[PDB]
Amino acid sequence: ATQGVFTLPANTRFGVTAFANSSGTQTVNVLVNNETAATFSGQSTNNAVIGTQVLNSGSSGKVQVQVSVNGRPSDLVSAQVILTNELNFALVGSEDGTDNDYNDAVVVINWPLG
Ligand SMILES: [Ca+2]
Ligand SMILES: [Ca+2]
Known part of the structure; x- marks a missing residue:
């Protein structure tokens, strides 16, 4: 199925x-309104934060995460969790290779803020 797409x-x-x-x-690309809204890039094997940013959901609430390594799109897994009907997590893992650990780039979206 389509992965990494979330309606906020x-x-x-x-x-x-x-x-x-x-x-x-x-290379983590974040699309709000089908237009690119933030880009994180980095390399780590130790769970390093390669980016963190606050964005606005926009008119449509459509938010899309895309991961590529060396210009090749990773395979994505995603889901959304809601706790106490108020706290939302949009979760993405990605696989750039063959071991299928799906942690090569991990992306978390949380809302609301404040
Ligand atoms: Ca991997
Ligand atoms: Ca990995």
């Missing part, structure tokens, strides 16, 4: 944070 409440601030666990340099 409109005009809502959310945080997006990316970690790396791979030999390769990860």
Whole structure:
């Protein structure tokens, strides 16, 4: 199925944070309104934060995460969790290789902020 796409409440601030666990340099692209809204890049094998930023959900609430390593799109897994009907986590893992640890770039989106 389509992965890494999440519908957020409109005009809502959310945080997006990316970690790396791979030999390769990860390029995390965050699209709000089908237009690019933030880009994280970095390399780590120790869960290093390669980016963190607060964005606004925009008119449509459509937020998309895309991961590529060396210009090759990683395979994505994703899901959304809601705790006490109020605290939202949009979760993405990605695989750039063959071991299928899906942690090569990990992306968390959380809202609401404040
Ligand atoms: Ca991997
Ligand atoms: Ca890995």
